Design a protein around this ligand. Sequence first.
Ligand SMILES: Nc1ncnc2c1ncn2[C@@H]1O[C@H](COP(=O)(O)OP(=O)(O)O)[C@@H](O)[C@H]1O
Ligand SMILES: [Mg+2]
Ligand SMILES: [Mg+2]
Lengths: 336, 20
Amino acid sequence: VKEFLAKAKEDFLKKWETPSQNTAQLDQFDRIKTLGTGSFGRVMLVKHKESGNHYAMKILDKQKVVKLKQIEHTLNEKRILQAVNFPFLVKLEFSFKDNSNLYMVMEYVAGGEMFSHLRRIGRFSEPHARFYAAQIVLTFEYLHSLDLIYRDLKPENLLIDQQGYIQVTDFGFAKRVKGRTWTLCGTPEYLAPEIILSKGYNKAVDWWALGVLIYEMAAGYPPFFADQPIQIYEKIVSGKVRFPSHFSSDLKDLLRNLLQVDLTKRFGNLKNGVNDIKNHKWFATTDWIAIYQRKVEAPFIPKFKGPGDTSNFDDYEEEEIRVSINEKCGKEFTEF
Amino acid sequence: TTYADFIASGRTGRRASIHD
Ligand SMILES: Nc1ncnc2c1ncn2[C@@H]1O[C@H](COP(=O)(O)OP(=O)(O)O)[C@@H](O)[C@H]1O
Ligand SMILES: [Mg+2]
Ligand SMILES: [Mg+2]
């Protein structure tokens, strides 16, 4: 399959080298409702006047970005997002900025975060969890082949589309790196031990995170948890994992290989790469090509009621979009 | 049960990313 990835890389490189800029403007959209928030910045449901299409607009306050020292991270996010193209990755339609904010307009994925459905239902059956896992596996295979590291896998960053398929959003911590990196970033429950221990890490962290994800989906709770992050880190470092009695023998086997504290033994980081994962028994009944082609019938299809429907998202407190009369941090975000 | 301990924990809602 190296053939496919090979030509996909040519596409990526072209856009990575010469990114698109300023492909729209704020007055072309009608701001409708906040779909979600994060460490900073919100995502709003917007409607494009000329086309009538609905999109999801991520808004970033330039000043907050600088305060939290996320300039480089924010620049990576946009540069990487506008260059990638994969069935399970959200599409960036437009990007632009003004005196105060940075804007990224993406396709609107109406199904809601996997998070909400997961918490509501409690947990997913293995066949259901496997369906989602396969899509992540292919996505990481694509991303890594481009020397990209995702670094923020979690149900909150995964969306369900109208067909019940996954759409990965939030490339806030995505980074193009050959070799190792050192930033302490991600989400506590999903941090790989090497990150916590500040040893310098690579793409292997994404595979560990997949382990945590699969576990959370099947169990209904993450493998390591507590009330304070520091308490969580201590458990992750220990590597001691307990499996619910309902977990299949194959699932447990796969998990012990992904949640492997030792990098030399962690699945995905070995000689056979992603194949150790794709060939594992738990995925025995998984038709990789069918998933890629989105020909598999989804085990769960979210209730959708026409375009613009946000019933699959929680409600958030709305707030004015402020645009100063003066340009803020112009130099810092020149390339954006 | 583990489930009951999790549900009673302070981290059952949406988790924020970190950049320490
Ligand atoms: N393309 C999208 N379609 C629909 N909802 C989205 C989309 N992108 C983001 N969201 C919502 O916005 C939230 C935050 O977006 P995200 O990129 O994760 O921002 P942050 O970096 O602040 O976490 C998500 O968890 C989700 O609920
Ligand atoms: Mg996020
Ligand atoms: Mg983010």
